Amino acid sequence: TYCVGIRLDEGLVFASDSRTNAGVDNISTFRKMHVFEVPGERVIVLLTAGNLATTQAVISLLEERLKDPEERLLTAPSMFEAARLVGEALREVQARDFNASFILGGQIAGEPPRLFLIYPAGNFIEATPDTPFFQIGETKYGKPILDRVITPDTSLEDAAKCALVSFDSTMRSNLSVGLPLDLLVYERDSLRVGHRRRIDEDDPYFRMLRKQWSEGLRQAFDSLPDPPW
Template identity: 50%
Template sequence: MTYCVGIATGEGLVFAADTRTNASHDNVRVHRKLHVFEWPGERAFVIMSAGNLATTQLTLARLRADVDDGAGRNLRRFTHLHEVVAYVGEVLAQSQLRPPDEENADSTEADGPDFGATLLLGGQIAGEAPGLYMLYSIGNAIQASPETPYLQIGETKYGKPILDRLAHPDLPLEDAARLALLSLDATMRSNISVGMPLDLALLRADALKVEPTLRLEADSLLYTELRSRWQHGLRQAVGMLPRFRWEPKAEP
């Protein structure tokens, strides 16, 4: 499993992802799920992936190959971000196609492995505003909005409540980054299939370059202090909640 989250604010975009792809008792594997494509001063994109690892790796390889080969349609040739999203969606859908199995021609999709994958794609092209999108396995997409300024893929339910309460378009970019990490931390506390290390990237509006980027290990000072202060703050907040009528009043 995996968990990736993107947050769109007026100051830019935040991307955060775990790196765990397998979590059996004797087989814990790590793969990067946050990928940067940038041409500073011209355009910058971040793609995060969840789902079948073979499909996402093939999709990313095809995107890079199209750029390297100067293909007629590649990440550098489009004028608008929505065109990039449509192109990446097509590559994603094509990467899930498998040749027919003549020996099992009567088998259904349910009989075989699941090659599905989803992506989060965010970025900016010079002259346009930044945008954040979620691409489904069939290639269609939805965009983050002021009403819903964050998008998630993978194991989303544990990290969603904090985003519902605190994510909004006016959030400073660094606060949004801290919020994304706390969303990941909440997920890891409840689901072993999401795990360290974590990757974080920021794309400031009009910077047209993805920076800074961080990889946080379990013992990283920033991460340990972040989760410690958050837990301490939550405990203090619980102590400040209204008292039941049978309780003594809380001391000021």
């Protein structure tokens, strides 16, 4: 479990892995990215982390077919209210280690793109130009590269590269995160899911990326100056 959401002037980038604690001596594959789209009016993306029984129960609550006006993710009047729905659903489930955590972002027509982190307690915060990304799951291995590269001015292409490299480092160093990944790249004001795919162990691009990052890192390392000793 590692999920990342990134917010840029140009749009949003989301990525998540699938390796999941599904009970004792059982780690299996479960998708952690969920998309709610009304093409030409809104796109909302939800990433999950923590206890699977809890996340699945939250998702089930948010999809309940006969809810009141403005109380479903598809009909929320703003992303702030959407985040509040996720948080309230989480609290409702907890009143029935079971903790869980989410990242929620997207765009609703006539409002810019926005990005939120929902905490275990069900309160939340919103990304800004100064803190333009969020992470949930096992996050510390992959944070340094995101801190080095991501700014509001970063292009969608580079932010996606940076997310993937972040996953590479995390997967090398911690066995609780693993392929397949989901990747979604959203262009500001499209109001449409533009690019979305699944990246598995055979993906040619992700293989090329890892191999060239590895070769280029080693060259950067080898050209660092020697101590005076």
